[PDB]
Every structure is written in structure tokens, then in C-alpha cells.
Structure prediction request, 317 residues.
Amino acid sequence: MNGTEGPNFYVPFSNKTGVVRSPFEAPQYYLAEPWQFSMLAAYMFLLIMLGFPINFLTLYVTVQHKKLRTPLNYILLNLAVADLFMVFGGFTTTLYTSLHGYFVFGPTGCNLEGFFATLGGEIALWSLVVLAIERYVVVCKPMSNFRFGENHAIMGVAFTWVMALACAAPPLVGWSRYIPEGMQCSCGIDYYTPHEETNNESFVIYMFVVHFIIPLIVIFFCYGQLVFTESATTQKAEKEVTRMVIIMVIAFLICWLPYAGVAFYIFTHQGSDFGPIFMTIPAFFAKTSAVYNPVIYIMMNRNCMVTTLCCGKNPLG
Ligand SMILES: *[C@@H]1O[C@H](CO)[C@@H](O[C@@H]2O[C@H](CO)[C@@H](O[C@H]3O[C@H](CO)[C@@H](O)[C@H](O)[C@@H]3O)[C@H](O)[C@H]2NC(C)=O)[C@H](O)[C@H]1NC(C)=O
Ligand SMILES: *[C@@H]1O[C@H](CO)[C@@H](O[C@@H]2O[C@H](CO)[C@@H](O)[C@H](O)[C@H]2NC(C)=O)[C@H](O)[C@H]1NC(C)=O
Prediction:
């Protein structure tokens, strides 16, 4: 048996070497070397450090500065919101764990991080279907009279919640379950087992198409009709803001693909001798999601932030 199984835990190590045990009371130091965990903490601290402020500051910049009620800034005020849940929820939760080397918060604790950590990641997918389509309808605009405003920018934002909710709830109330992964410090969806008692395989189909490949093909279908793209004074300033979005389509697919792809490799190889590092690393590499969003948002589009940050502002242009 390449691993070891229980009622509320799967772990990739063989009890052949009579040393495996639950990750809920004792530490899992037979998964890796002690020092490696310390790094996942050091890694984790930075995810809390840089994440919280840059998200919370953009939440505080916008609330005071009422001139950023733009349909551009509306979506990037939705992500800063969803990032803060992954800091105080998803990151803190796991920080604790990495340091000691075991889920102390318990089974219910594993069900808290997952509900949050999947919520934040899928909010950055259902919101990109508004970002990919907001840009599509004003470059390939089929209806001249139409305009993107606030009844479209709040009810396009609430579409992202109401579809991300339908992604994170299922494990809590029927379809599958949240469960510790790799080094047993993060907690995501069950990718490994059948557990027919709670319908795993049937949630995964629904998740791979509807909660991944549907938003991916929709962001190839509208990306594909912007390939063909006059006095370009108004164009040229607004062709680097189109670019900015692509960098958060790129950086997304650098971070979340290693995890996404390896997750499929395991779901095909249902119980091979795949290690702990193998599944963990891409998750935590993918979990920089909440930090890179507003950095490029400041390095490409920026003034308002320094203005609240200032003390005595001065006019620059
Ligand atoms: C494979 O690994 C174990 C041996 O490597 C094997 O033995 C049993 O492991 C459990 C671990 O929970 C022990 O249970 C003890 O756990 C704590 C001690 O802090 C107490 O709360 C419990 O009451 C209990 O004392 C068992 O003692 C141990 N059996 C032996 C060897 O005496 C498990 O069968 C395998 N591990 C898993 C998770 O399936
Ligand atoms: C136990 O670990 C072994 C590693 O040697 C796994 O071996 C694979 O088993 C499949 C059969 O499903 C073979 O056809 C392959 O050649 C092996 N390699 C890989 C990477 O696929 C084996 O899967 C594990 N046993 C299980 C399923 O518990």
C-alpha cells in the first residue's frame, strides 16, 4: 500500500516502516526533514506579511477616495476583499500548522481553511469571466448604445460570489470533503480516494469542467476574437491596461497550473507512490494568489495609493 488510510485522513507514506500515524495528534515528521517545514512557515509568513496590507490598503484607499468607482477598480476591489479572507483565514490557519508540524485545529479546522482557500481561488476565476468579457465588449463592441457602469459592475461582481459559493460549499454538505494535503498543513478537496460514502468522483467531474475548463475555454474564446486588434491617441493609453489583465492571466497560469496539472496526475494515478512534497509545493507556490494581484495593479495602471499614503501631496503627471 503506497500510503496509509483512515476515516478522516489520507497520508502519502507506507506504514510498512511501522511509524505512520494520524496527523491530528502527533507530528508527521516522517513525511519530510524537520528543516523543510520551517521554510514553509517562512514562506507562509511572507504570504501573510505582504498580502494583508496591500489588499487592506486598497480597501482603505478606495473607500476614502470616491473617484475610483470605475468598473476597472470595481473588480480589483472584489479581489482585495477575497484576499483578506485567505490571510486571516487560509494563511493563519496553515501558519500554525507548518510551525508545529500537524493539524491541531482538528477535523473541523481542516474544513475551515478549505472552504476559504477554495473561495479565494475561484473568486479569481469567476471574476476573470467579467474581466475577460468587460474588455471584449468595448473592443469588439456589437451594440453601440451599451455602456459598462454600476448596475453592470455590482451585478457582474455578485455573479462571482454566487458561483464561487457553489464551488466551496459542496464538500461541507454532500459532494466530497476537505482533507489535508501532502505535508498535511494545507487543506483542499479530496483528489486521491473514492469515498463513495460522500460522492467524490462525481464532484470532481463537475469541478474540472464547470469550475476550471469552462472559465478557461471562455477566456480562450473571447481572447481569440481580440487577436485581430485609425488615430491611436485614445487607443495607446488604453492598450497597456488591456495588457495588465493579460499579465494576471499569465501569472495566474504560472502559479496555479503546477498545482492544477499535478492534481490531475494524482486523480489518474489514484494511489501511486507519489510523495508529500510533490503535492504540497505547487499549492503553496500557487497560494501567492493574494499577493501578486495588486503589485502589477500598481506597477502598470498607482497615484491614488501614494496620495492617501502621502502626508503633504504634490501634483505629479
Ligand atoms: C500504522 O502506524 C502505527 C505504527 O507505526 C500503527 O499503530 C498504532 O498507531 C496509533 C496512532 O494513533 C497508536 O494510538 C495511540 O495514539 C495516542 C498516543 O498519543 C493515544 O491517544 C491513543 O489512545 C493510542 O495510545 C497505537 O498505539 C498504535 N498501535 C500500536 C503499534 O500499539 C497504526 O495502526 C497505523 N497508523 C494508522 C494511522 O493507521
Ligand atoms: C505502489 O507503488 C508503485 C511504485 O512502484 C506503483 O507502481 C505503478 O503501478 C502501475 C500499476 O497501476 C504500474 O503499471 C506502473 O508501472 C507503476 N508506476 C507508475 C508511476 O504508474 C503502484 O501504482 C503503487 N500501488 C498502488 C496502486 O497502490
